[PDB]
Design a protein around this ligand. Structure first.
Ligand code: NAG
Ligand code: FE
Ligand code: FE
Length: 287
């Protein structure tokens, strides 16, 4: 809660330790506690989950699955007690009933998940400056480890969007040096569409760690999927064209970590916050 005239929001990915008991890991809990404090101090408009919402197989019963609850219970703290959530389909969520998590947005007011992929539209308290967010379904758009109209949808969308800012998120990485690494189909089908229509940046998770990349076009690459797991791998450093990596954190001994974004009249900022509370990397992107 701060009188800042900017669009703010936390962006986590890959949280949720189910199956088994409980539904959390030391780390999810840690991030839950920090994402709660971070928003008490800075304040947050919403929260977007970048994927892998219920870790091994995401949800049986459409809405009724009991895991939809232990998430509600993990992110239980008066601070987040009323903060909107915009969800995304991860790969593990596609091993379960996805339509389930979509419909779940009818049982929970804070849980928002209209379609596997959809368009969000916000506005900075400084009026004129409006932002467009395109939530996509990467499993449906790719396959590496059923949406040829999704890729065709994003085309028209991005080509028709007139907002001042345009962000795009999905679960699979375009660029990433970690364990999974760049995803061939995204690098081929999506990447060209960002610089093409001037997308400010691409947020994603999937690789259990924290990293910020940036191509020679100024399009930024925010990879913040470390809310439950932490992977120290960089097997794909070589697969990322030198100069793109600007920041990376995936140490073994560290609990979670996530990102905080603040878009204002002039620029969009991305500060990376470790579970602990320390801001370990920040950078901003032009309008
Ligand atoms: C998936 O979720 C939908 C949405 O409520 C539900 O109607 C359906 O029973 C579920 N489908 C399967 C195959 O479990
Ligand atoms: Fe994943
Ligand atoms: Fe994951």
């Amino acid at each position: 809660t701060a009188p800042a005239s900017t669009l703010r929001f936390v962006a986590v990915g890959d949280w949720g330790g189910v199956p088994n008991a409980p539904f959390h890991t030391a780390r999810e809990m840690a991030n839950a506690k920090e994402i709660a404090r971070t928003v008490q101090i800075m304040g947050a408009d919403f929260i977007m989950s970048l994927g892998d919402n219920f870790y091994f197989t995401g949800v049986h019963d459409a809405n009724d699955k009991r895991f939809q609850e232990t998430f509600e219970d993990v992110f239980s703290d008066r601070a987040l007690r009323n903060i909107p959530w915009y969800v995304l389909a991860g790969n593990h969520d596609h091993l379960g009933n996805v339509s389930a998590q979509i419909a779940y947005s009818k049982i929970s007011k804070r849980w928002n998940f209209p379609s596997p992929y959809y368009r969000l539209r916000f506005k900075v308290p400084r009026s004129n400056i409006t932002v467009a967010i395109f939530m996509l379904d990467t499993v449906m758009l790719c396959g590496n480890s059923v949406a040829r109209t999704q890729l065709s949808w994003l085309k028209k969308q991005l080509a028709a969007a007139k907002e001042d800012y345009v962000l795009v998120a999905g679960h699979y990485p375009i660029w990433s040096i970690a364990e999974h690494g760049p995803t061939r189909c995204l690098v081929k089908n999506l990447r060209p569409l960002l610089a093409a229509y001037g997308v400010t940046a691409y947020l994603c998770g999937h690789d259990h760690n924290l990293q910020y990349l940036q191509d020679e076009n100024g399009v930024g690459y925010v990879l913040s999927g470390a809310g439950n797991f932490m992977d120290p791998s960089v097997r794909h450093q070589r697969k990322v064209p030198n100069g793109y990596l600007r920041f990376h954190y995936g140490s073994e001994d560290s609990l979670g970590g996530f990102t905080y974004v603040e878009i204002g009249s002039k620029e969009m900022s991305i500060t990376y916050v470790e579970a602990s509370g320390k801001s370990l990397f920040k950078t901003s992107l032009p309008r």
